[PDB]
């Protein structure tokens, strides 16, 4: 009860802290700086300093798929669905689908009156990858959202729950991380999610305590790649006595 | 596709899981068994018989 | 020595000597050509 309110007021104070001082972090008193900041580096420039994308990939990146060229794969798949007529059920046919292994809980939803639809996926849309999607905050909602909390995503005929990661939308090679979704400009939320070919609409919903869904952000799917990289910045302080 | 008539057959009633038959008009393109079927509330599956 | 305390055990052979010379205040000092290719 009150511990959720205290954590929410801590979220509000973090918004005040991270906006005036952008990414400033105090020096740890007891922990050695070489241990806490071991996997860190400094760059001379913020726009033109090179960075290896293949460097230091954790165990999570071994569970997802990769594309040698996403643009050519998207063009190849879209060409063969417009040109080739695969031998199957044609449009306008009243067909019936025998689907293999579904729970019975699908059926009682239909008996209650909830509409049930289905759609055949394209090739390589069932596999896992990293989604990049552009969002913009609804003016009608004012509650701030943090970087790594659970949110409900409606992304191209699909609904799923995941925690995003907000980064600045910039034409540069690397994007600075944004901790809180500012309600004036477009940001990018990166989600471990199934592959969905663009264009596809993106809606974000925050689950209220009383079961309500409040619309937060709207936009589209930008690209499907894990090569996009997010950089978190740290400012240390020192006094020239 | 939109489900017009839905009926169920359970493979095992204690397993609560079985084959589902959904009937509706094909809408977008040519629907084929060689790609998966996604129900919007229940994830990916496989059809077997059309 | 200015940094730490040196524990010295006074043997009977150190009678005429001072105490400062058994705690040394300094550390010893401890101290690839071009060939043209074209």
């Amino acid at each position: 009860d009150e511990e959720a309110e205290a954590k929410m007021l801590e979220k509000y104070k973090q918004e005040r802290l991270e906006e005036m001082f952008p990414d400033e972090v105090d020096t740890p008193r007891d922990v050695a700086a070489r241990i806490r900041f071991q996997k860190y580096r400094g760059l001379k420039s913020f726009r033109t300093s090179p960075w290896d994308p293949k460097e230091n990939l954790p165990q999570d990146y071994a569970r997802i798929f990769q594309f040698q060229n996403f643009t050519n794969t998207r063009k190849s798949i879209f060409k063969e669905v417009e040109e080739k007529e695969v031998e199957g059920a044609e449009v306008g046919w009243y067909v019936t689908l025998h689907v293999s292994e579904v729970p019975v809980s699908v059926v009682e939803c239909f008996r209650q009156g909830t509409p049930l639809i289905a759609f055949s996926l394209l090739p390589h849309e069932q596999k896992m990858s990293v989604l990049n999607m552009v969002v913009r905050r609804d003016p009608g909602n004012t509650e701030p959202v943090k970087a790594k909390e659970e949110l409900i995503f409606h992304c191209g005929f699909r609904r799923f729950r995941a925690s995003p990661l907000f980064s600045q939308h910039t034409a540069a090679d690397k994007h600075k991380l944004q901790r809180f979704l500012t309600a004036d400009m477009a940001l990018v939320a990166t989600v471990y999610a199934p592959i969905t070919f663009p264009p596809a609409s993106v809606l974000l919903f925050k689950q209220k305590s009383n079961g309500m869904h409040s619309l937060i952000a709207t936009g589209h799917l930008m690209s499907v790649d894990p090569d996009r990289m997010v950089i978190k910045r740290v400012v240390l302080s020192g006094h020239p006595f | 596709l939109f489900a017009h008539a839905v009926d169920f057959v359970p493979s095992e009633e204690n397993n609560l899981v079985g084959t589902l038959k959904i009937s509706g008009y094909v809408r977008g393109q040519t629907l084929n068994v060689n790609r998966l079927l996604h129900i919007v509330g229940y994830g990916d599956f496989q059809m077997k018989q059309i | 020595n200015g940094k730490t305390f040196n524990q010295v055990e006074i043997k009977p052979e150190m009678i005429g000597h001072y105490l400062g010379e058994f705690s040394i205040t300094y550390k010893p000092v401890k101290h690839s050509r071009f060939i043209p290719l074209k």
Binding site: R63, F65 | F45, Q46 | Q7
Partner: peptide, 22 residues
């Protein structure tokens, strides 16, 4: 027919001497 593989199927110093004089 494609499968439902969203995840990859493949898995000599004395006792009283200080460290300075050592």
């Amino acid at each position: 027919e494609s499968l439902q593989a969203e995840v990859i199927p493949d898995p000599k110093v004395p006792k009283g001497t200080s460290s300075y004089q050592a």
